[PDB]
Amino acid sequence: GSSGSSGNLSELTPYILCSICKGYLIDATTITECLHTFCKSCIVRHFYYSNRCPKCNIVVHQTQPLSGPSSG
Numbered sequence: 068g069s070s071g072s073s074g075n076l077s078e079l080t081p082y083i084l085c086s087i088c089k090g091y092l093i094d095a096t097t098i099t100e101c102l103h104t105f106c107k108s109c110i111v112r113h114f115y116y117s118n119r120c121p122k123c124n125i126v127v128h129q130t131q132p133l134s135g136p137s138s139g
């Protein structure tokens with residue numbers, strides 16, 4: 068199977084890219100601290116293991132000052 072489709076080129080801020088996904092974004096959740104762009108799942112996932120920013124490495128104490136147990 069091919070299932071191959073693509074062909075899009077534009078000129079805009081190269082920041083759109085994700086420091087994690089290293090590609091396109093989905094939710095486009097911007098931080099209110101360092102003002103960085105990170106996919107909801109990305110920033111949310113990174114906050115699960117590390118309460119810091121995978122960009123500047125800052126302990127963003129916005130979501131919650133508590134780590135919390137392993138309750139799904």
Ligand SMILES: [Zn+2]
Pocket residue numbers: 085086087088089092105106109
């Ligand atoms: Zn991402």
Ligand SMILES: [Zn+2]
Pocket residue numbers: 098101102103120121122123124125
């Ligand atoms: Zn940051």
